Amino acid sequence: TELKIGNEKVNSTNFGDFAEKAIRGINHKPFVNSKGGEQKITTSKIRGILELVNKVYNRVINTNDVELSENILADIAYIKVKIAYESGREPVVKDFIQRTAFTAAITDVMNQRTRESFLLFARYVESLIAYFKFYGGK
Amino acid sequence: TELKIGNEKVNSTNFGDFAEKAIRGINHKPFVNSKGGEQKITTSKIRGILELVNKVYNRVINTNDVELSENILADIAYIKVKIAYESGREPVVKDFIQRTAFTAAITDVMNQRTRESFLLFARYVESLIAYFKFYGGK
Amino acid sequence: TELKIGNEKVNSTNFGDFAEKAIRGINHKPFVNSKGGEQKITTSKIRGILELVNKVYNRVINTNDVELSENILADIAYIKVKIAYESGREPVVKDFIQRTAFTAAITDVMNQRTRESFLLFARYVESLIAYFKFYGGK
Amino acid sequence: MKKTYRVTLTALGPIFIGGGEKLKKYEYIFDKQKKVAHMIDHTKFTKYLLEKNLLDDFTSRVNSHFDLYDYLVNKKGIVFMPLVKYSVPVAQFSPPMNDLNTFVKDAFGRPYIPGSSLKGALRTAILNDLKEDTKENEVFAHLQVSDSETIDLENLKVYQKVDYSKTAKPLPLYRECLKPNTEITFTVSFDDEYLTLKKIQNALHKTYQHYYIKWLKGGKVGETLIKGVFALDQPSQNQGEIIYIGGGAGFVSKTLHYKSKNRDQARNDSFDILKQLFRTTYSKMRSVPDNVPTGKHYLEMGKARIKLEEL
């Protein structure tokens, strides 16, 4: 019922307020692609991870149990692998995952081994998408 | 019993008048798109937000407790997240949210944490729907 | 007393005559749609408004205070909000409210804020419905 | 009335339709010696990672470069029997295999020509008249094309873009393509009042004629002839039996202005509309061939042989 972005992650609140703050900080100083360059993130570079997270959410919502099964754990491992791949592809997804502690959320969900942990992680992912589209987007 | 908007205030009795003036301001100065195009918001654009508001209204009204529960507040925070997402998806929806005070009212409901504040917020959104359909409609 | 109906006021000796006159003017040159009319209003189109008015009347009639309380004024404000709702939901109700000034009477009650003003409004509404039947109906 | 028409497509050259793009080797293995590329079964890949060296250790090295060839066999020294789904030969014919555009596939990994691909390839022919009637045009609202049928995984290959401007310059873009001489099955239907088979054939023939005598042959007699000849046969006047489907077909195949205006007007219109898109101090567009074994067999990119039949 709680994972670690670095400070706290409660179901009741601040699962979207921390998305507020992460997106505001990203807009506060956007990533620098190169010394003589200007860069801004596009939501098309998160889409694979979003698809994987949504698929795992659909798989886990139909479970009357707390701990995620072994196949779901392999799916979360795949989610982390895809995070690494799509972060290494364009090194602005690297900045996006670093400043949002998204990989840290993945690791916390893996450690907790609880359904509500992944549900709150998915809620934070939805908050990140929502507040990125709100302030920025494109 | 009293939700904040900024300079102006909304109570249990003046919610309808404030919703009417907010809608009238929108119709008097309709939102202009990027290509010099005036647009009118549709009920289907905010249908998901309205159903989320009504979904948690049903569970709030079946609760004779002054303080809102943790899961109810989680639902309300998710509603605010969805409002931000829909604002980021459509510029006209974002303009409708900004001209009204859905974000301000919902965050004041999160601030007050009380059952009556959310009921007055639901009253305000109902009055905004009513006066939106009164003048322009879908 | 002296309930303002926009053009001409009504009081305890007037409401029935003006209700009958408004209903007869409804039947003379009735509402026209975009497709050339030619239907009139039905009871199951303002039934919700009538039920709200009945509930508020029951609440007021059990109070001896000359001034309406804020808890009842909230109910009257919601009545006005709903009247705006079905007025914009269908134009066959909009002109019915306009010509038989439900909204003007509601505003005058919400301004006088007195028990007698709302009682006169309720009597006017009852006479309006009574003359709407026996001449039209449905 | 509606008449169905089974459609068979044979790609004379390589045809590429994308479904995703991958950077340097992270999701696939490339043995540079044997010119063979292996795609790792990713779920078995993560199961193997869970069974062996830690996933964090594996993913701590994704900082560009980092080919899986020099990690699975060099840094770990392990064999990869289960980490394969299909193999694709590679055509390196001096810019390295930096990027690989994989062919579009369904859930099970089978390649297939997706929806609206053949629809656009037919719109680029039937739309010969005007650019106005596009959405409300009832011509294509009644045209009904289907998806491709089963395609063998063995019929895939990796090719590099090749140029025509005064030489054949290799390009860093490498993409996955179906090899030539591969049979593809479709199914297209349409209303008789709005469209007819002979109308489709006439549109295809007119498009190919304006492509060949005005652009292909015209651009050949304006740039060079002996550069193509390795083979570069490029047959023409084949009863309008040619359609260009897939990526790398050319900028001409995606625009309809050479077949509605003469040479000079269409040339100037293309130059003006493309200089807005791209700021290059260059000249008219050039062909986009490729090479395949060994000789430099020049094949026209996206060249497909389109034949139809009743029902």
Added chain:
Amino acid sequence: MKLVIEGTIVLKTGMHIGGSSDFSAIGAVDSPVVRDTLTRLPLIPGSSLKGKMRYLLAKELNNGILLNEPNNDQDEILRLFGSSEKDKIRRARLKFNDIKLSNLAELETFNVSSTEVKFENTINRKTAVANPRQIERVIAGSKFDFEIFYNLDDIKEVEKDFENIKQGFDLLEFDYLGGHGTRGSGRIAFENLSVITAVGNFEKINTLNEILGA
């Protein structure tokens, strides 16, 4: 009685029966498919299948002409699919049902999701600009076991009704079920068709099962 027309809908291509973009996870595909609210399984609405089958059968029973209202179709169409006529209201003999995805176990063991994300774009001919598009479709090979209830209002006109039902099922074969069927999506293939008796037993049911399976 209540003859049950059973079978299976197999997706030859991806199918996109349009669900609401809202009422789902934030950040999902722009155009999602309709799903069961509880199980999140992809759904074939009974109303959509009924409407497509009625459109195809009424067109085929009217020599490929349909410019009339649904209540002004053929007598067989009106009796199978119902009517709201003022003169006489015909109760529909066919009762369609919402069809859930059924072969989720085999899709799980083949390591494929129930839905695939399709990558599409539209390119102008005046300008070489292609606008990206995101569309969700249920993957091909997805089975959909259904159950259509049939009413024996009259016993004489049951073989003709089931012949019409088979004709409607076969018309869906050379057509799409829902969504962007113009562009290759939504191809279906009925299989394992059969008819069973809900209560007790029905004579000559073998004749109906023979004209329904082939």
Added chain:
Amino acid sequence: MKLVIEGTIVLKTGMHIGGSSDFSAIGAVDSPVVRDTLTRLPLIPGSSLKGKMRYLLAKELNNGILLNEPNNDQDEILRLFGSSEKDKIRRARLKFNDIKLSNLAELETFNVSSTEVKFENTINRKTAVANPRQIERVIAGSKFDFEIFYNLDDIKEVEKDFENIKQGFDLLEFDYLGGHGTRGSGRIAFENLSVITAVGNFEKINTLNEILGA
């Protein structure tokens, strides 16, 4: 002697019992379902379940056809559902009740509301233009535990009465309960059908349970 018929109604597909559509707040769905006024819980009215069960049972019991007024049904139908004739007033042995859904907690476990919104359109045939609409449905998987009171008036026909009751429940399982049933909605199932004695004991309650369970 009085008997209580326990059981659960499980929604196989979405169910839509038409609501008031005049008091469900402002800005709600176009066509709402009927709900309990206090708890806002969707319910199956006893009148609607009774009417559907009576229609199906009277149609199946008489000849398979049913065209008469409700008061001119068979003796079994009249003794189970009551009659208001002049000289033949049958007191109904069955007392139906409004059925609110009970597994709201189970539905909230899957983070889904009790009711969904179903998007439908009608495509005008002469124009080929769609007309979208929205309806509200109680989601599939909702459970409605009901209670029906049986007046044990004649000991000589309680077995036949319960055979008819089980038959009516079976007929409801091959039909729909309220709403746009032919268009995929309203399919229900019955399980945990057990009859218990309201007060005291019934010496043939074991035979009643086995005909109510099979």
Added chain:
RNA sequence: CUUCUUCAGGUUGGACAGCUGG
């Protein structure tokens, strides 16, 4: 070496409305 992450169009219509008995 190139940018677009979706744009455009529909947004509910018709029917029934209390009847029998004391």
